[PDB]
Amino acid sequence: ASQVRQNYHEDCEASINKQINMELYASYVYLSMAYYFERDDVALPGFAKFFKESSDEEREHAQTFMKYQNKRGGRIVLQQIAAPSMQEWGTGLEALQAALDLEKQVNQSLLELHSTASGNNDPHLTKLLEDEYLEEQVDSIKKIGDMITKLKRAGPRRLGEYMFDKELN
Amino acid sequence: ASQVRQNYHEDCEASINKQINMELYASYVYLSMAYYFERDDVALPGFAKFFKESSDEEREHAQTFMKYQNKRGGRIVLQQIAAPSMQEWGTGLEALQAALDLEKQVNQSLLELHSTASGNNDPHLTKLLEDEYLEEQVDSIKKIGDMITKLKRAGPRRLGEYMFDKELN
Amino acid sequence: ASQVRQNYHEDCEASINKQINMELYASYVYLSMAYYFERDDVALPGFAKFFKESSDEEREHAQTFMKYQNKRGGRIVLQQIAAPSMQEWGTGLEALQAALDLEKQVNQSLLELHSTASGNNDPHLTKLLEDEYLEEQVDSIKKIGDMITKLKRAGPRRLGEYMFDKELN
Amino acid sequence: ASQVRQNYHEDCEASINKQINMELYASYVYLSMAYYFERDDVALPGFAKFFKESSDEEREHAQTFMKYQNKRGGRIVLQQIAAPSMQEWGTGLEALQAALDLEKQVNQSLLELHSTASGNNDPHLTKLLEDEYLEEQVDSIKKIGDMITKLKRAGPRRLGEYMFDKELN
Ligand SMILES: [Cl-]
Ligand SMILES: [Cl-]
Ligand SMILES: [Cl-]
Ligand SMILES: [Cl-]
Ligand SMILES: [Cl-]
Ligand SMILES: [Cl-]
Ligand SMILES: [Cl-]
Ligand SMILES: [Cl-]
Ligand SMILES: [Cl-]
Ligand SMILES: [Cl-]
Ligand SMILES: [Cl-]
Ligand SMILES: [Cl-]
Ligand SMILES: [Cl-]
Ligand SMILES: [Cl-]
Ligand SMILES: [Cl-]
Ligand SMILES: [Cl-]
Ligand SMILES: [Cl-]
Ligand SMILES: [Cl-]
Ligand SMILES: [Cl-]
Ligand SMILES: [Cl-]
Ligand SMILES: [Cl-]
Ligand SMILES: [Cl-]
Ligand SMILES: [Cl-]
Ligand SMILES: [Cl-]
Ligand SMILES: [Cl-]
Ligand SMILES: [Cl-]
Ligand SMILES: [Cl-]
Ligand SMILES: [Cl-]
Ligand SMILES: [Cl-]
Ligand SMILES: [Cl-]
Ligand SMILES: [Cl-]
Ligand SMILES: [Cl-]
Ligand SMILES: [Cl-]
Ligand SMILES: [Cl-]
Ligand SMILES: [Cl-]
Ligand SMILES: [Cl-]
Ligand SMILES: [Cl-]
Ligand SMILES: [Cl-]
Ligand SMILES: [Cl-]
Ligand SMILES: [Cl-]
Ligand SMILES: [Fe+3]
Ligand SMILES: [Fe+3]
Ligand SMILES: [Fe+3]
Ligand SMILES: [Fe+3]
């Protein structure tokens, strides 16, 4: 084993490689959305900026897991990143709904990893998940939920969507 | 009696303890409204901020009466604070209407205390009420009335409510 | 359910509404103590300031739980806030002893909530409790214990109480 | 009558000349106390400073009434200022007790003047009394009451008096 490895179970190592792929995929989905909202026939720059920042944040999350794998003496194994589920994302509301569902899927995967880490008595990994992943995930879900409610109030199409988009820019 | 007490009638002392409870109750109502407007399915941050500031102001009013009781040599007697009348406050307009009615109930109680103080020839207490309570109460009632009119013009629901909420934030 | 709710058990939601009431009650107790120490026949401004800050901190704790309830998609339910157990709090030492006992009761309730959250496999809630509640609670208990010892050394009445009160101001 | 006089009753004018004498007398009492506390066999510089400031404040109050008399078109009539009741004022506590009683006598006289002004329907004079006299009088009485309680806790003689005197300096 690595000279640094201690109390680090192979199942946790493998699941971290899964989380890395998942968050690179989420980053790719959000990148797709970001540029979809910059099409000349869409032109929602607030939504575009929101999704570009979300894309960057998911990539940073994946990188934090890569750094963590090395810190514990595990070995990063990178897999193909699937194409985004869609090429076109519909209305602003539909993109936010897709984002909410994706964030809740990532949250479920992170909670499953926390359960794996807890079952293997790895408190360093449970702490990482609590502090660096689960908190930001809940905050993101609440933010997107709020956004959905606000956009449904404002619009969710036509002038209300135009005005809501300005709040994100 | 207290070594400081002078020209301070027991009925005024008791009524001040009533005003303290009333304004703590009003503070609690506004706290409830503040967090109602931060629910993910409500998401009106301007209304939330308006009610959080109103909650703080009512608590400060109660504290000023507690300080006043001690200044005159009366004795603070604290009672249970009732649960807010509602757990959910409806639309922004409905919450403002509830706030207007509550402010006018508090104003009526303060005017009754002023009449009690005047009838007991307590000019220190009539001055307190005029300067520290009755003025702010009338200003609050006018502000809320204005807000109701503006929100009815803008909306009072859908895009107009979304836009009005931004004026409060 | 709320569009944001995920891995949030009804028993945790209900217990959070309990913690909110408990900490609003504790805030009210400390507010009572604060103004008791500003009576003209008590006149302990250091104790008054200590309890006014404690009152503010407990209210902030309650508000953090209200925000948390909304973040997770639970629903805030506010109940009556009981009158403080006493209207007059005795000596400075007696008030500190009452505060120590109250802080340990709140700590026990928070530890019970942590056990509920752990049993329901809610690591977001266990992290909240550890970071935002249990640490400050232990620090408050140690501070009050220290204060009790110092006041017993200095006094706990007469000149020693007068001098100790200056250390808190 | 004076070219400025309007709605100014002779009884109010005469009572103001009384208040002027009373507050010059109170100023003289406090001046006596101030220098009593600077005797080499007393040597309480905090008490001395407290009474010198009190003396100045009472003289300023008298001067505000002199200015007021002229503002309304009344005529200042100055009388002899009696010698202070004592030449030696005893302990710090005894001087504070004498000050409390004097402040409450002045307060009673001011409240009687307010009743005279109210009965003569002079709202300019009732406002003067409320804003420039009755408020400061109640605050002074509460401060002295607090001081008495603190000094009784600390001492009121020997080391506690020595230490309390430092809080006033
Ligand atoms: Cl290796
Ligand atoms: Cl290992
Ligand atoms: Cl292993
Ligand atoms: Cl292991
Ligand atoms: Cl597509
Ligand atoms: Cl839509
Ligand atoms: Cl897993
Ligand atoms: Cl919709
Ligand atoms: Cl559209
Ligand atoms: Cl349409
Ligand atoms: Cl009493
Ligand atoms: Cl009285
Ligand atoms: Cl009475
Ligand atoms: Cl009376
Ligand atoms: Cl309800
Ligand atoms: Cl409505
Ligand atoms: Cl009344
Ligand atoms: Cl309407
Ligand atoms: Cl709406
Ligand atoms: Cl409609
Ligand atoms: Cl709900
Ligand atoms: Cl759930
Ligand atoms: Cl459940
Ligand atoms: Cl659950
Ligand atoms: Cl009691
Ligand atoms: Cl004691
Ligand atoms: Cl529990
Ligand atoms: Cl003891
Ligand atoms: Cl004592
Ligand atoms: Cl003793
Ligand atoms: Cl003349
Ligand atoms: Cl006249
Ligand atoms: Cl006349
Ligand atoms: Cl007249
Ligand atoms: Cl003498
Ligand atoms: Cl004495
Ligand atoms: Cl008179
Ligand atoms: Cl004594
Ligand atoms: Cl002595
Ligand atoms: Cl002795
Ligand atoms: Fe992520
Ligand atoms: Fe109020
Ligand atoms: Fe707490
Ligand atoms: Fe005066």
From TrEMBL, chains A, B, C, D:
Residues that hold Fe(3+) 6 according to the record: E57, E103, E136, S140
GO biological process per UniProt: intracellular iron ion homeostasis; iron ion transport
Swiss-Prot/TrEMBL catalytic activity: 4 Fe(2+) + O2 + 4 H(+) = 4 Fe(3+) + 2 H2O
Amino acids binding Fe cation: E23, E58, H61, E103, Q137
Binding site for Fe(3+) 3: E23, E58, E103
Record GO terms (molecular function): ferric iron binding; ferrous iron binding; ferroxidase activity
Binding site for Fe(3+) 1: E23, E58
Binding-site residues for Fe(3+) 2, renumbered to this chain: E23, E58, H61
Key words of the record: Iron, Iron storage, Metal-binding, Oxidoreductase, Zinc
Alphabetized InterPro entries for the sequence: Ferritin, Ferritin-like, Ferritin-like_diiron, Ferritin-like_SF, Ferritin_DPS_dom
Binding site for Zn(2+): D131
Pfam family, one: Ferritin
A GO-annotated cellular component: cytoplasm
Binding positions (Fe(3+) 5): E57, E58, E103, Q137
Amino-acid positions noted as binding Fe(3+) 7 in the UniProt annotation, renumbered to this chain: E58, E103
Domain Ferritin-like diiron: residue ranges: 6-155
Job description of the protein: Stores iron in a soluble, non-toxic, readily available form. Important for iron homeostasis. Iron is taken up in the ferrous form and deposited as ferric hydroxides after oxidation.
Similarity comment: Belongs to the ferritin family.
Name of this protein: Ferritin
